[PDB]
Design an enzyme around this catalytic site. Structure first.
Site, PDB file in Angstrom:
ATOM      1  N   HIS E  61       0.857  -1.102   0.055  1.00 50.82           N
ATOM      2  CA  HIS E  61      -0.005   0.064  -0.044  1.00 50.82           C
ATOM      3  C   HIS E  61       0.588   1.191  -0.133  1.00 50.82           C
ATOM      4  N   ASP E  91       9.886  22.155 -25.401  1.00 54.85           N
ATOM      5  CA  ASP E  91       9.811  20.787 -24.739  1.00 54.85           C
ATOM      6  C   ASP E  91      10.732  20.878 -23.682  1.00 54.85           C
ATOM      7  N   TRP E 126       7.083   0.169   5.096  1.00 53.70           N
ATOM      8  CA  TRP E 126       7.583   0.396   3.924  1.00 53.70           C
ATOM      9  C   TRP E 126       9.005   0.971   4.292  1.00 53.70           C
ATOM     10  N   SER E 156      14.628   6.686 -12.233  1.00 52.55           N
ATOM     11  CA  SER E 156      13.615   7.262 -12.967  1.00 52.55           C
ATOM     12  C   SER E 156      13.495   8.841 -12.536  1.00 52.55           C
ATOM     13  N   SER E 157      13.370   8.742 -11.216  1.00 56.43           N
ATOM     14  CA  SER E 157      13.433  10.366 -10.753  1.00 56.43           C
ATOM     15  C   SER E 157      14.421  10.978 -10.450  1.00 56.43           C
ATOM     16  N   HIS E 240      12.630  12.055   5.127  1.00 55.14           N
ATOM     17  CA  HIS E 240      11.976  13.298   5.466  1.00 55.14           C
ATOM     18  C   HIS E 240      11.750  14.118   4.242  1.00 55.14           C
ATOM     19  N   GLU E 242      11.875  13.356   1.132  1.00 56.73           N
ATOM     20  CA  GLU E 242      10.634  12.323   0.501  1.00 56.73           C
ATOM     21  C   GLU E 242       9.144  12.994   0.730  1.00 56.73           C
ATOM     22  N   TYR E 244       8.549  16.029   1.800  1.00 59.97           N
ATOM     23  CA  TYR E 244       8.148  17.227   1.633  1.00 59.97           C
ATOM     24  C   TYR E 244       7.932  17.399   0.017  1.00 59.97           C
ATOM     25  N   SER E 255      -1.664  26.964  -5.197  1.00 59.64           N
ATOM     26  CA  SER E 255      -1.363  28.390  -5.209  1.00 59.64           C
ATOM     27  C   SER E 255      -1.965  28.965  -6.673  1.00 59.64           C
ATOM     28  N   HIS E 290      13.605  12.935  13.833  1.00 61.01           N
ATOM     29  CA  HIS E 290      12.508  13.017  14.615  1.00 61.01           C
ATOM     30  C   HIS E 290      11.777  11.561  14.209  1.00 61.01           C
ATOM     31  N   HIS E 291      12.040  10.706  13.484  1.00 59.38           N
ATOM     32  CA  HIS E 291      11.600   9.317  13.238  1.00 59.38           C
ATOM     33  C   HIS E 291      12.347   8.524  13.925  1.00 59.38           C
ATOM     34  N   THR E 316       6.010  27.303   6.575  1.00 55.46           N
ATOM     35  CA  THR E 316       4.805  27.030   6.291  1.00 55.46           C
ATOM     36  C   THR E 316       3.610  27.794   6.722  1.00 55.46           C
ATOM     37  N   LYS E 319       2.921  30.444   4.094  1.00 52.27           N
ATOM     38  CA  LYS E 319       2.415  29.966   2.893  1.00 52.27           C
ATOM     39  C   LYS E 319       0.607  29.934   3.100  1.00 52.27           C
ATOM     40  N   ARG E 438       0.653   0.540  15.412  1.00 54.42           N
ATOM     41  CA  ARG E 438       0.480   0.533  14.059  1.00 54.42           C
ATOM     42  C   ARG E 438       0.826  -0.854  13.646  1.00 54.42           C
TER      43      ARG E 438
HETATM   44  C1  HEA Z   1       2.909  15.397   3.080  1.00 57.80           C
HETATM   45  C2  HEA Z   1       3.559  14.527   3.771  1.00 57.80           C
HETATM   46  C3  HEA Z   1       4.217  15.257   4.933  1.00 57.80           C
HETATM   47  C4  HEA Z   1       4.249  16.495   5.646  1.00 57.80           C
HETATM   48  C5  HEA Z   1       4.089  17.665   4.887  1.00 57.80           C
HETATM   49  C6  HEA Z   1       4.704  16.362   6.968  1.00 57.80           C
HETATM   50  C7  HEA Z   1       4.788  17.514   7.526  1.00 57.80           C
HETATM   51  C8  HEA Z   1       5.028  17.316   8.924  1.00 57.80           C
HETATM   52  N1  HEA Z   1       5.229  16.355   9.851  1.00 57.80           N
HETATM   53 FE1  HEA Z   1       5.080  14.572   9.115  1.00 57.80          FE
HETATM   54  N2  HEA Z   1       4.801  12.533   8.463  1.00 57.80           N
HETATM   55  C9  HEA Z   1       4.693  11.863   7.339  1.00 57.80           C
HETATM   56  C10 HEA Z   1       4.003  13.188   6.167  1.00 57.80           C
HETATM   57  C11 HEA Z   1       4.328  14.418   6.300  1.00 57.80           C
HETATM   58  N3  HEA Z   1       4.615  15.152   7.254  1.00 57.80           N
HETATM   59  C12 HEA Z   1       4.850  10.545   7.259  1.00 57.80           C
HETATM   60  C13 HEA Z   1       4.693   9.819   5.964  1.00 57.80           C
HETATM   61  C14 HEA Z   1       5.120  10.071   8.468  1.00 57.80           C
HETATM   62  C15 HEA Z   1       5.287   8.760   8.992  1.00 57.80           C
HETATM   63  C16 HEA Z   1       6.472   7.932   8.393  1.00 57.80           C
HETATM   64  C17 HEA Z   1       6.348   6.552   8.820  1.00 57.80           C
HETATM   65  O1  HEA Z   1       6.970   6.584   9.936  1.00 57.80           O
HETATM   66  O2  HEA Z   1       5.809   5.794   8.124  1.00 57.80           O
HETATM   67  C18 HEA Z   1       5.375  11.319   9.196  1.00 57.80           C
HETATM   68  C19 HEA Z   1       5.668  11.352  10.578  1.00 57.80           C
HETATM   69  C20 HEA Z   1       6.239  12.435  11.321  1.00 57.80           C
HETATM   70  C21 HEA Z   1       6.828  12.210  12.572  1.00 57.80           C
HETATM   71  C22 HEA Z   1       7.372  10.905  13.027  1.00 57.80           C
HETATM   72  C23 HEA Z   1       6.535  10.630  14.593  1.00 57.80           C
HETATM   73  C24 HEA Z   1       6.800   9.239  14.895  1.00 57.80           C
HETATM   74  O3  HEA Z   1       7.037   8.315  14.225  1.00 57.80           O
HETATM   75  O4  HEA Z   1       6.838   8.909  16.067  1.00 57.80           O
HETATM   76  C25 HEA Z   1       7.257  13.493  13.067  1.00 57.80           C
HETATM   77  C26 HEA Z   1       8.059  14.123  13.988  1.00 57.80           C
HETATM   78  O5  HEA Z   1       7.997  15.167  14.350  1.00 57.80           O
HETATM   79  C27 HEA Z   1       6.364  14.382  12.266  1.00 57.80           C
HETATM   80  C28 HEA Z   1       6.284  15.981  12.189  1.00 57.80           C
HETATM   81  C29 HEA Z   1       6.038  16.680  11.030  1.00 57.80           C
HETATM   82  C30 HEA Z   1       5.987  18.101  11.008  1.00 57.80           C
HETATM   83  C31 HEA Z   1       6.600  18.880  12.088  1.00 57.80           C
HETATM   84  C32 HEA Z   1       5.387  18.697   9.898  1.00 57.80           C
HETATM   85  C33 HEA Z   1       5.684  20.058   9.448  1.00 57.80           C
HETATM   86  O6  HEA Z   1       6.118  19.962   8.098  1.00 57.80           O
HETATM   87  C34 HEA Z   1       4.011  20.432   9.399  1.00 57.80           C
HETATM   88  C35 HEA Z   1       3.904  22.199   9.449  1.00 57.80           C
HETATM   89  C36 HEA Z   1       2.591  22.656   9.079  1.00 57.80           C
HETATM   90  C37 HEA Z   1       2.078  23.314  10.010  1.00 57.80           C
HETATM   91  C38 HEA Z   1       2.641  23.507  11.395  1.00 57.80           C
HETATM   92  C39 HEA Z   1       0.376  23.746   9.733  1.00 57.80           C
HETATM   93  C40 HEA Z   1       0.367  25.112   9.179  1.00 57.80           C
HETATM   94  C41 HEA Z   1       1.287  26.343   9.889  1.00 57.80           C
HETATM   95  C42 HEA Z   1       0.297  27.054  10.539  1.00 57.80           C
HETATM   96  C43 HEA Z   1      -1.039  27.502  10.282  1.00 57.80           C
HETATM   97  C44 HEA Z   1       1.129  28.385  11.143  1.00 57.80           C
HETATM   98  C45 HEA Z   1       1.168  28.263  12.700  1.00 57.80           C
HETATM   99  C46 HEA Z   1       1.485  27.034  13.204  1.00 57.80           C
HETATM  100  C47 HEA Z   1       2.107  26.954  14.379  1.00 57.80           C
HETATM  101  C48 HEA Z   1       2.636  28.307  15.304  1.00 57.80           C
HETATM  102  C49 HEA Z   1       2.235  25.620  15.350  1.00 57.80           C
HETATM  103  N4  HEA Z   1       5.923  13.728  10.936  1.00 57.80           N
HETATM  104  C1  HEA Z   2       0.229   8.970  -0.647  1.00 58.45           C
HETATM  105  C2  HEA Z   2      -0.080   8.120   0.195  1.00 58.45           C
HETATM  106  C3  HEA Z   2      -0.954   7.669   0.977  1.00 58.45           C
HETATM  107  C4  HEA Z   2      -2.238   7.415   0.431  1.00 58.45           C
HETATM  108  C5  HEA Z   2      -3.239   8.408  -0.423  1.00 58.45           C
HETATM  109  C6  HEA Z   2      -3.144   6.510   1.428  1.00 58.45           C
HETATM  110  C7  HEA Z   2      -4.299   6.276   1.292  1.00 58.45           C
HETATM  111  C8  HEA Z   2      -4.965   5.242   2.153  1.00 58.45           C
HETATM  112  N1  HEA Z   2      -4.332   4.880   3.306  1.00 58.45           N
HETATM  113 FE1  HEA Z   2      -2.623   4.705   3.812  1.00 58.45          FE
HETATM  114  N2  HEA Z   2      -0.638   4.293   4.192  1.00 58.45           N
HETATM  115  C9  HEA Z   2       0.345   5.150   3.654  1.00 58.45           C
HETATM  116  C10 HEA Z   2       0.334   5.929   2.490  1.00 58.45           C
HETATM  117  C11 HEA Z   2      -0.811   6.275   1.764  1.00 58.45           C
HETATM  118  N3  HEA Z   2      -2.091   5.997   2.299  1.00 58.45           N
HETATM  119  C12 HEA Z   2       1.726   4.918   4.286  1.00 58.45           C
HETATM  120  C13 HEA Z   2       3.294   5.396   3.967  1.00 58.45           C
HETATM  121  C14 HEA Z   2       1.412   3.857   5.146  1.00 58.45           C
HETATM  122  C15 HEA Z   2       2.370   3.237   6.097  1.00 58.45           C
HETATM  123  C16 HEA Z   2       2.776   1.993   5.715  1.00 58.45           C
HETATM  124  C17 HEA Z   2       3.700   1.229   6.901  1.00 58.45           C
HETATM  125  O1  HEA Z   2       3.334   1.323   7.993  1.00 58.45           O
HETATM  126  O2  HEA Z   2       4.716   0.770   6.458  1.00 58.45           O
HETATM  127  C18 HEA Z   2      -0.007   3.789   5.319  1.00 58.45           C
HETATM  128  C19 HEA Z   2      -0.593   2.720   6.202  1.00 58.45           C
HETATM  129  C20 HEA Z   2      -1.949   2.704   6.312  1.00 58.45           C
HETATM  130  C21 HEA Z   2      -2.726   2.342   7.282  1.00 58.45           C
HETATM  131  C22 HEA Z   2      -2.020   1.670   8.536  1.00 58.45           C
HETATM  132  C23 HEA Z   2      -1.992   0.237   8.310  1.00 58.45           C
HETATM  133  C24 HEA Z   2      -1.259  -0.318   9.650  1.00 58.45           C
HETATM  134  O3  HEA Z   2      -0.515   0.658  10.442  1.00 58.45           O
HETATM  135  O4  HEA Z   2      -1.495  -1.584   9.898  1.00 58.45           O
HETATM  136  C25 HEA Z   2      -4.069   2.696   7.083  1.00 58.45           C
HETATM  137  C26 HEA Z   2      -5.129   2.025   7.756  1.00 58.45           C
HETATM  138  O5  HEA Z   2      -6.192   2.400   7.859  1.00 58.45           O
HETATM  139  C27 HEA Z   2      -3.923   3.207   6.063  1.00 58.45           C
HETATM  140  C28 HEA Z   2      -5.192   3.409   5.239  1.00 58.45           C
HETATM  141  C29 HEA Z   2      -5.417   4.224   4.101  1.00 58.45           C
HETATM  142  C30 HEA Z   2      -6.705   4.510   3.286  1.00 58.45           C
HETATM  143  C31 HEA Z   2      -7.918   3.885   3.795  1.00 58.45           C
HETATM  144  C32 HEA Z   2      -6.484   5.037   2.307  1.00 58.45           C
HETATM  145  C33 HEA Z   2      -7.723   5.783   1.476  1.00 58.45           C
HETATM  146  O6  HEA Z   2      -7.681   7.265   1.350  1.00 58.45           O
HETATM  147  C34 HEA Z   2      -7.803   5.237   0.060  1.00 58.45           C
HETATM  148  C35 HEA Z   2      -8.807   6.150  -0.848  1.00 58.45           C
HETATM  149  C36 HEA Z   2      -8.522   6.610  -2.137  1.00 58.45           C
HETATM  150  C37 HEA Z   2      -7.773   7.705  -2.087  1.00 58.45           C
HETATM  151  C38 HEA Z   2      -7.931   8.688  -0.921  1.00 58.45           C
HETATM  152  C39 HEA Z   2      -7.018   8.145  -3.507  1.00 58.45           C
HETATM  153  C40 HEA Z   2      -7.668   7.994  -4.884  1.00 58.45           C
HETATM  154  C41 HEA Z   2      -6.838   8.932  -5.699  1.00 58.45           C
HETATM  155  C42 HEA Z   2      -6.664   8.351  -6.868  1.00 58.45           C
HETATM  156  C43 HEA Z   2      -7.389   7.119  -7.275  1.00 58.45           C
HETATM  157  C44 HEA Z   2      -5.821   8.882  -7.985  1.00 58.45           C
HETATM  158  C45 HEA Z   2      -6.859   9.506  -9.169  1.00 58.45           C
HETATM  159  C46 HEA Z   2      -5.977   9.824 -10.554  1.00 58.45           C
HETATM  160  C47 HEA Z   2      -5.996  10.885 -11.295  1.00 58.45           C
HETATM  161  C48 HEA Z   2      -7.129  11.988 -11.322  1.00 58.45           C
HETATM  162  C49 HEA Z   2      -5.055  11.117 -12.410  1.00 58.45           C
HETATM  163  N4  HEA Z   2      -2.868   3.417   5.172  1.00 58.45           N
HETATM  164 CU   LIG Z   3      10.217  13.412   8.896  1.00 56.70          CU
END
Ligand code: HEA
Ligand code: HEA
Ligand SMILES: [Cu+2]
Ligand SMILES: [Cu+2]
Ligand SMILES: [Cu+2]
Ligand SMILES: [Mg+2]
Ligand code: NA
Lengths: 58, 79, 43, 261, 514, 47, 84, 227, 79, 84
Positions: E61, E91, E126, E156-157, E240, E242, E244, E255, E290-291, E316, E319, E438
């Site tokens: 997944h 292009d 993953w 590829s990327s 991380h 990744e 962003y 935007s 932080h992970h 952030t 924005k 989890r």
């Molecule tokens: C789209 C992807 C995405 C983005 C953008 C971010 C954004 C953020 N994530 Fe996270 N995060 C994930 C996806 C993402 N993350 C994933 C996949 C994992 C789990 C991976 C795994 O273990 O499998 C993860 C897990 C993860 C962890 C690990 C926790 C753990 O495993 O125990 C932590 C730890 O700090 C963290 C923090 C953050 C923070 C600080 C931001 C910041 O970038 C957010 C900043 C945004 C805001 C703050 C809101 C808007 C701001 C305002 C309105 C201004 C005012 C705000 C304040 C003054 C507070 N994220």
């Molecule tokens: C992009 C990232 C992404 C997205 C979109 C989702 C989508 C979903 N994920 Fe998540 N998921 C992850 C990435 C993502 N996940 C990751 C990283 C983990 C951790 C794995 C790990 O622990 O190792 C995770 C794990 C995870 C868990 C935890 C499993 C566990 O800990 O045992 C759960 C459980 O509910 C969950 C559920 C869902 C569900 C219900 C959707 C639903 O939202 C599905 C609904 C469908 C959509 C929301 C998207 C539809 C969009 C399209 C079809 C494209 C359209 C195309 C065009 C227009 C061109 N996911």
């Molecule tokens: Cu991170």
């Protein structure tokens, strides 16, 4: 040696409607066909291996 | 001279969550003290402290394998 | 965004059919496997 | 759909990307067949289609530039950025291996004797062959520079001469490194020390071969007059890549051979 | 000729289209997998039978949604289609290489599919951490097949990043500076830099995992003096960035959408907006640990990583506020795309705030590895990335196809998905706070209610995606061609009509050096 | 080159018949959604 | 050490030719002389079955799966000790 | 432990967990503030016919929206770090217990004086005596004296595992070849549950941890009865 | 057990012309052994070796000043 | 750590102005915040008359010849111990 670059410029600029990978002659074509054959053949071969391995073969 | 030992106390040399060296060091130190005191005709009762400490901290399995290694002479640490 | 009228308009009926076919292509294959989960689990 | 009035290159549809992509599939799965079902056929087929693809893809790039004149100044500038960016990612690739090395050697584990190098390992002497390798590579950094200048000054004989020396030096390093691998008293299976040592220098060694053939290609292109005193990007890239290889070695030497032993 | 055009392409538009198709398909696979997950957890007990199949599914997944749906669509799809059009380029810089970036994806996907079919698949998560991913706990080809899929996707990327950066930097009108390129273009340039620098560290990491499994090295095996923690550092050093990389292109699209439907010529604080993405990009490279807050690192370094992670909220914040400032005084058109954008702005804020909670290493001790983190990333990914992807899609669909969507159906679609996703993930915050781990296939009875509601929400979203497929069908079936488009003066991509000709900008734009 | 241009012509699939399109789309997304379910089945059927 | 050979370590193909033959190559000959007036043979190391060496978690996919790629019998012992 | 339909953290059994509950209340207060502010602003922006589509000066407000969040973050960080440092604080323990994760069960070792060692497996749901918790019961609990500072050392003998006990505010990964230390301290007697918190394979969901806290006196006799 | 001592033998830890560390180390080691054996109720007869060695190698004046330093508690070495 | 802020870290006075106010100066503020949310006061070190410290082979040519140039009484003891 001798500079025959000008001569190759002419061969390749010749308006024969051929894409660059074939514009060079009859050999480009055999290489091309050899390459495409091995790629497709091998790809088929790999898909087959994937199949065999997919099932418990032991 | 302590035998009113509860458990290995805090050791500033190993102040963080990772205590791998604490076990290791005390295990080494003991066998090195034991060897000296046995090799210079002396008392191993000095070496006791280290055994208590390394015994408290080291996983059973680590202590077993290290001993086995010392027996076969493949113990990597310089004792 | 402005557009010309549909060149080949899809009446409500045609839509109903298109929507039905779509849903089915998603639900049938998965329902089949899921329904038979036991038949596989028991080995 | 008129006559273009921009200086960029629109390339003819090409099958090489597809072929190269398929090659990647063949090699990776071929590697999977080798590692697990002890067979090399797939991997062999994959290696073959890969060379055929690289040969033809780069052949066309020559045709398009030297023969068809599509490399206008705008196109060249693009190629420069591409090369540089490529080198950058290669630098980060190697950074992973230096991280691994520093991670292991700065905090040797109990199972190693709690010391670096691990007890039981007899490291090579950095003042012997490794010093030699160092001098061979740096020397080729100097000869390639003379080659470059000869070229810019239009001196065909000296460019070929300097290029030749550079190449034999790189070949020489490969042979020396291969000999050392054989003579070494530790292997890749000798824990983190042998792991770290052989994949880091092994990959570098692989890059020295890639750079050498790149230079060999430049050699032949020069024999056939492809380069002009002002337009010779294939060579510049060949040279930049060569200096990268040179620098990476310096880091290996200091880190792994010197400091790490 | 289908071949010359579709398999031997060198056209940024056709390649972009290929990516949207691949990504759409992969999204179905990913959605199916997400349903099997919730199916298993929708009732106490076990459904799949063996928990290794569950783990295999959870892993697949993640890889599918991240590597085969989000990135291809955002970067490969919208990136190739729009980037050249927005800067008046003929292009991409390397159109032949660009085609290889695309064609490396199907093989890569195949390998991932193959891994779950041979042996017992890769139930590693993953993160594919060793020893669980080592040749002892996961013997067989599976993990190795997974590693190879990742190599191809990385290549590829990386190749794609080189193309985008070169293009964006070298192929603009001679008079146009970087500070005159639209935000999406900036967003894809910054993302490309991140990919260029992070992907190679991952490649190094998984190559070391591969040699440990097959060449008897011990980078991560303590037996040889290795360290399983070393893997974590390398993986997350890529990981991380990744996350962003998965959201930046979305920041760009949002935007453009907010600006357009508000009837503005430009987004508010354009330079503050550029500054923000650079900052996020930069700081995104120094917070990886932080992970790893429960891994046993020194307290001082844990204090550093929580401190550093928090500053990311400042850029952030500018924005989020800039998007709101853009709406200010706008003449708002409530189009489907605008609806998707408003949802993004809010949902993303929730998911990001929740990430600030997790930034605290002290608090992360008890939240780490619980469903609270699954809730966080699904808010920012399933309601961030995906919502941007949907807004961008309905907005530009007419430019790509020349046909329009039925706006009412599109709004119906948004409404359903909005309910589905919240119902699905909101409850999960509770599960985490209350301790549910989890990657579990079953849970103590107490967690039944929330898991039940959650699995139910997931079926609502299913309805939404089926509906979406229909929506695309009807647009193509009805054939309403586009006539006029609004605001072309500040939206170049539309100037060549819908769809633009195979070759655009055959004669460059004309821009004065005033 | 001489590739066709315009609505319904810049795509690798024909959109000339809405019902044949219905079929191709169905197969396309359908096979996609179906794959995971059959893999799970395949795995359940080895043991 | 340090370095300083007067000037002209930049600009002119003649200069780089000069450095190539007057500094680079001679350095290579010296290091070659050294690396040969030193390199004889290290007596093969005593074999002691340490567990952190001669690792085998999976057999090599070639030969008998117990010999590393550039296995040198004189200096590389198998896990059981030297070969012959 | 967790009860049906629970929303927040499990009740705190130790002092640091108490500290965390309060720190979390604090942080949540702020996330409610910000998230409600953002929603109010969004609704404000979308509710008027007044327009002003011409350009607005950028810089002026950008400072408020940079300085304010910087202040709020300092308000979350100070406390966060204070507690972070308390958790690691130089404690002087009166007992050391080791736990080793294994593929599918935890084993405990009390070796300060004796060589007490035992395995701890989950009790199958089919062998549960009425009133016992489904996937949480372990056959041999880890007994420890209440009201004392215990030092736990976590490691593993195979893959990674994570030893956790929510109620007490603990989670320390168990990593082969590494000994991680954490400090346990319960202010009440009772039974406290936790579960493996690092994916470890097929039975990662079935290797719980149950702590039993009783007075010293009863701990000693129990130690001896366990050999 | 040696008292059939002629003089400090070759020590591979200090193989070069500079023997400053050889004296220093043995001086340290002795006082550390002496302290341990006196602090854990044991025999200092184990610590003898070091005293003979450091006595043979260390200049009189160095030994005198180090002792004086230890007395006043300003000895820089960690004993 | 590492670094990567997208592109434009070169060419254009506007670019360097951008880096000056968007990256350089903000770094200084952060380090200033840190260096002040940490910098309080180190308790003055226990005085122990080590011979390798407070060296005096010749009196300083200023003051009473026994006080270093930036002598700080709270933290710098004279050879005889702290001043007041
Ligand atoms: C789209 C992807 C995405 C983005 C953008 C971010 C954004 C953020 N994530 Fe996270 N995060 C994930 C996806 C993402 N993350 C994933 C996949 C994992 C789990 C991976 C795994 O273990 O499998 C993860 C897990 C993860 C962890 C690990 C926790 C753990 O495993 O125990 C932590 C730890 O700090 C963290 C923090 C953050 C923070 C600080 C931001 C910041 O970038 C957010 C900043 C945004 C805001 C703050 C809101 C808007 C701001 C305002 C309105 C201004 C005012 C705000 C304040 C003054 C507070 N994220
Ligand atoms: C992009 C990232 C992404 C997205 C979109 C989702 C989508 C979903 N994920 Fe998540 N998921 C992850 C990435 C993502 N996940 C990751 C990283 C983990 C951790 C794995 C790990 O622990 O190792 C995770 C794990 C995870 C868990 C935890 C499993 C566990 O800990 O045992 C759960 C459980 O509910 C969950 C559920 C869902 C569900 C219900 C959707 C639903 O939202 C599905 C609904 C469908 C959509 C929301 C998207 C539809 C969009 C399209 C079809 C494209 C359209 C195309 C065009 C227009 C061109 N996911
Ligand atoms: Cu991170
Ligand atoms: Cu476990
Ligand atoms: Cu587990
Ligand atoms: Mg974890
Ligand atoms: Na279940």
């Amino acid at each position: 040696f001798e500079n025959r670059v000008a001569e190759k410029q002419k061969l390749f600029q010749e308006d024969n409607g051929l894409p660059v990978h074939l514009k060079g002659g009859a050999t480009d074509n055999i290489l091309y066909r050899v390459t495409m054959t091995l790629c497709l053949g091998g790809t088929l071969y790999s898909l087959y291996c994937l199949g065999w391995a997919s099932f418990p073969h032991k | 001279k302590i035998k009113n030992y509860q458990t290995a106390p805090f050791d500033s040399r190993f102040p963080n969550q990772n205590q791998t060296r604490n076990c290791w060091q005390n295990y080494l130190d003991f066998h090195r003290c034991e060897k000296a005191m046995t090799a210079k005709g002396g008392d191993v009762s000095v070496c006791e402290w280290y055994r208590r400490v390394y015994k408290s901290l080291c996983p059973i399995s680590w202590v077993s394998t290290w001993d086995d290694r010392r027996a076969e002479g493949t113990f990597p640490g310089k004792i | 965004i402005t557009a010309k009228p549909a060149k080949t308009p899809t009446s409500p009926k045609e839509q109903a059919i298109g929507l039905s076919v779509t849903f089915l292509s998603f639900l049938l294959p998965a329902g089949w496997v899921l329904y038979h989960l036991d038949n596989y689990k028991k080995s | 759909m008129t006559h273009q009035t921009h200086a960029y290159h629109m390339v003819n549809p090409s099958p090489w990307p597809l072929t190269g992509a398929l090659s990647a599939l063949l090699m990776t799965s071929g590697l999977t067949m080798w590692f697990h079902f002890n067979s090399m056929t797939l991997l062999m087929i994959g290696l073959t289609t890969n060379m055929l693809t690289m040969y033809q893809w780069w052949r066309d790039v020559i045709r398009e530039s030297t023969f068809q004149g599509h490399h206008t100044p705008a196109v060249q500038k693009g190629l420069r950025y591409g090369m540089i960016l490529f080198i950058i990612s290669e630098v980060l690739f190697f950074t992973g291996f230096f991280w691994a090395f520093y991670h292991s050697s700065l905090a040797p584990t109990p199972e190693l004797g709690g010391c670096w190098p691990p007890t039981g390992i007899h490291p090579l002497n950095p003042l012997e062959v490794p010093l030699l390798n160092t001098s061979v590579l740096l020397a080729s950094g100097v000869s390639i520079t003379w080659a470059h200048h000869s070229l810019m000054e239009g001196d065909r004989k000296h460019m070929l001469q300097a290029l030749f020396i550079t190449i034999t030096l790189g070949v020489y390093f490969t042979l020396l490194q291969a000999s050392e691998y054989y003579e070494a008293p530790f292997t890749i299976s000798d824990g983190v020390y042998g792991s770290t040592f052989f994949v880091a220098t092994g990959f570098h060694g692989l890059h020295v071969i890639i750079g050498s053939t790149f230079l060999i290609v430049c050699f032949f292109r020069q024999l056939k007059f492809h380069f002009t005193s002002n337009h010779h990007f294939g060579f510049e890239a060949g040279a930049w890549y060569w200096h990268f290889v040179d620098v990476v070695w310096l880091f290996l030497y200091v880190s792994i051979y010197w400091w790490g032993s | 000729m289908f071949i010359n055009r579709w398999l031997f392409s060198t056209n940024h538009k056709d390649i972009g289209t290929l990516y949207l198709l691949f990504g759409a398909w992969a999204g179905m696979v990913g959605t199916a997998l997400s349903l099997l997950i919730r199916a298993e957890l929708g009732q106490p007990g076990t459904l799949l039978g063996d928990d290794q199949i569950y783990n295999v599914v959870v892993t697949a997944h993640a890889f599918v949604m991240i590597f085969f749906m989000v990135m291809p669509i955002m970067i490969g799809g919208f990136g190739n289609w729009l980037v050249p059009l927005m800067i008046g380029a003929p292009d991409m810089a390397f159109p032949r290489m660009n085609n290889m970036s695309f064609w490396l994806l199907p093989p890569s996907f195949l390998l991932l599919l193959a891994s779950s079919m041979v042996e017992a698949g890769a139930g590693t998560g993953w993160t594919v951490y060793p020893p669980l991913a080592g040749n002892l706990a996961h013997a067989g080809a599976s993990v190795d097949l997974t590693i190879f899929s990742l190599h191809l996707a990385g290549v590829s990327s990386i190749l794609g990043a080189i193309n985008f950066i070169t293009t964006i930097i070298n192929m603009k009108p001679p008079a146009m500076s970087q500070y005159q390129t639209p935000l999406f273009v900036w967003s894809v340039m910054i993302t490309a830099v991140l990919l260029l620098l992070s992907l190679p560290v991952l490649a190094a990491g998984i190559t070391m995992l591969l040699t440990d499994r097959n060449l008897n090295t011990t980078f991560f095996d303590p037996a040889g003096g290795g360290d399983p923690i070393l893997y974590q550092h390398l993986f997350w050093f890529f990981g991380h960035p990744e996350v962003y990389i998965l959201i930046l292109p979305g920041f760009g699209m949002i935007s453009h959408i907010v600006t357009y439907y508000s009837g503005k010529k430009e987004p508010f604080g354009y330079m503050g907006m550029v500054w923000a993405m650079m900052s996020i990009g930069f700081l995104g490279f120094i917070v990886w640990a932080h992970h790893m807050f429960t891994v046993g690192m020194d307290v001082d370094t844990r204090a550093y990583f929580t401190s550093a992670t928090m500053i990311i909220a400042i850029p952030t914040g500018v924005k989020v506020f800039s998007w709101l400032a853009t709406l200010h005084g706008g003449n708002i058109k409530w189009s489907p795309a605008m609806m998707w954008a408003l949802g993004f702005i809010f949902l993303f804020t929730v998911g990001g705030l929740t990430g600030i909670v997790l930034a605290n290493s002290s608090l992360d001790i008890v939240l780490h590895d619980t469903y609270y983190v699954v809730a966080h990333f699904h808010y920012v990914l399933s309601m961030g990335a995906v919502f941007a992807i949907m807004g961008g899609f309905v907005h530009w669909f007419p430019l790509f196809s020349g046909y329009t969507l039925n706006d009412t159906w599109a709004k119906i679609h948004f409404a359903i998905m909005f309910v589905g996703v919240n119902m699905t993930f909101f409850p999960q915050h509770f599960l985490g706070l209350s301790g549910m781990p989890r990657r579990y296939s079953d849970y103590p009875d107490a967690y039944t209610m929330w898991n039940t509601i959650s699995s139910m929400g997931s079926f609502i979203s299913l309805t939404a995606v089926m509906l979406m497929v229909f929506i695309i069908w009807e647009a193509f079936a009805s054939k309403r061609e586009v006539l006029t488009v609004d605001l072309t003066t500040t939206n170049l991509e539309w100037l060549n009509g819908c769809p633009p000709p195979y070759h655009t900008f055959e004669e460059p734009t004309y821009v004065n050096l005033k | 080159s001489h590739y066709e241009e315009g609505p319904g012509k810049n795509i690798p699939f024909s959109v000339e018949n809405k019902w044949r399109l219905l079929a191709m789309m169905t197969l396309f997304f359908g096979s996609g959604f179906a794959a995971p379910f059959f893999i799970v089945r395949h795995q359940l059927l080895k043991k | 050490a340090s370095a300083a050979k007067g000037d002209h370590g930049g600009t002119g193909a003649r200069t780089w030719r000069f450095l190539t033959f007057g500094l680079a190559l001679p350095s290579v000959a010296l290091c070659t002389l050294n690396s040969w007036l030193h390199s004889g043979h290290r007596e093969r190391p005593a074999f002691i079955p340490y567990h952190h060496l001669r690792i085998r978690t999976k057999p090599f996919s070639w030969g008998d799966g117990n010999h590393t790629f550039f296995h040198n019998p004189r200096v590389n012992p198998l896990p059981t000790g030297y070969e012959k | 432990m967790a009860y049906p339909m629970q929303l927040g953290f499990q009740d705190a059994t130790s002092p640091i967990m108490e500290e965390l509950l309060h720190f979390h209340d604090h942080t949540l207060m702020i996330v409610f503030l910000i998230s409600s502010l953002v929603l109010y602003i969004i609704s404000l922006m979308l509710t008027t016919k007044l327009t002003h589509t011409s350009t607005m000066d950028a810089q002026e407000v950008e400072t408020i929206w940079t300085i304010l969040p910087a202040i709020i973050l300092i308000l979350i960080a100070l406390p966060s770090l204070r507690i972070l440092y308390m958790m690691d604080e130089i404690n002087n323990p009166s007992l050391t217990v080791k736990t080793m994760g294994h593929q599918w069960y935890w084993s405990y070792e009390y070796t300060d004086y004796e060589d007490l060692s035992f395995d701890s497996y989950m009790i199958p749901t089919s062998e549960l005596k009425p009133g016992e918790l489904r996937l949480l019961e372990v056959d041999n609990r880890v007994v420890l004296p209440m009201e004392m500072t215990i030092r736990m050392l976590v490691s593993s003998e195979d893959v990674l595992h994570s030893w956790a006990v929510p109620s007490l505010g603990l989670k320390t990964d168990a990593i082969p070849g590494r000994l991680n230390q954490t400090t346990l301290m319960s202010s009440r007697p009772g039974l406290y549950y936790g579960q493996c918190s690092e994916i470890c394979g097929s039975n990662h969901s079935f290797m719980p941890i149950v702590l039993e806290l009783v007075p010293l006196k009863y701990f000693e006799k129990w130690s001896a009865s366990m050999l």
